[PDB]
Amino acid sequence: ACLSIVHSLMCHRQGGESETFAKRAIESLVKKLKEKKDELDSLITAITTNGAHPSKCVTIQRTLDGRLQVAGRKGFPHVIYARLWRWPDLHKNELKHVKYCQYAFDLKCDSVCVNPYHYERV
Amino acid sequence: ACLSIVHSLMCHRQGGESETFAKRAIESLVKKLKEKKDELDSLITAITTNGAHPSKCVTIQRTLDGRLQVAGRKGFPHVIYARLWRWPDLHKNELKHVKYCQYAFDLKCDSVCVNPYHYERVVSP
DNA sequence: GCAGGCTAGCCTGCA
DNA sequence: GCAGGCTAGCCTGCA
Ligand SMILES: [Cl-]
Ligand SMILES: [Zn+2]
Ligand SMILES: [Zn+2]
């Protein structure tokens, strides 16, 4: 079910993290999108087609400091997933959201867009 | 739980429908957004400020045929809420979605955006 | 567990 | 081929 989805998404990882961390990060994200069909499908089709066409926001709940914990490690959620699928060498303060993103990290909403195609590297 | 949201939204109705119809339409929408905090806040702020600043999509589940039933009446959900808060005289095929709307009626997604400020009025062909 | 109300989905009657 | 009406299924207020 989710295991089938995870594996397809793992095939697009850029190697900027260990296999165990990437699996942990993907499983965590997929579980959160299990009851959000449209957003899950937006993530899968944007990852696979390399953000060819505009995609919908893929959101998760924002924490107070804005950091997500995956396998005992903390980091910004939009950074973790942009590093994972687009920029393995991504650093701090290198991500600027696209104009059409509604839940971009910087907006400090209750939700964060972790769609890596909703950010451009700067 | 919170009927204070329904009351504040009822104050912005344009009178194109009966008080009873409007109350049922708003109650139905608010119940669907009860566990979607961001979407509910985007709706309240968009209505109150007359869509001054860009707002997020306010979505509900799409039915098979696209129509929503409220108080025994069926209609397109984006039309029902655009009539209620923006155009009381609104007719069929007079809405066109804004470029930044992700869940527009026309896209036939799982979800339908009912944010009236995510649609602009057009002349029917 | 139960009473009762709301509506998506299905069906039909005029067109 | 639509508009609109009927109701199974789902949900909730209840004691
Ligand atoms: Cl009204
Ligand atoms: Zn986004
Ligand atoms: Zn929208």
Author numbering:
A (entry chain B): 15 to 136
B (entry chain A): 15 to 139
Give the text the authors published on this PDB structure:
The receptors for TGF-β, nodal, activin, myostatin, and other family members are membrane serine/threonine kinases that phosphorylate and activate Smad2 and Smad3, whereas analogous receptors for the bone morphogenetic proteins (BMPs) preferentially phosphorylate and activate Smads 1, 5, and 8. These receptor-activated Smads (R-Smads) form heterotrimeric complexes with Smad4, which is required for the transcriptional regulation of most target genes. Focusing on the human and mouse Gsc promoter, here we identify specific Smad-binding GC-rich motifs and provide the X-ray crystal structures of Smad3 and Smad4 bound to several of these motifs. The structures determined here reveal that the β-hairpin is flexible and adaptable to bind with high-affinity several variants of the consensus sequence GGC(GC)|(CG), which we refer to as 5GC SBE.
The X-ray crystal structure of the Smad4 MH1 domain in complex with a GGCT-AGCC oligonucleotide was determined at 2.98 Å resolution (space group P212121). The ASU contains two Smad4 MH1 monomers and one dsDNA molecule. The conformation of the Smad-bound GGCT motif is intermediate between that of GTCT and that of GGCGC.
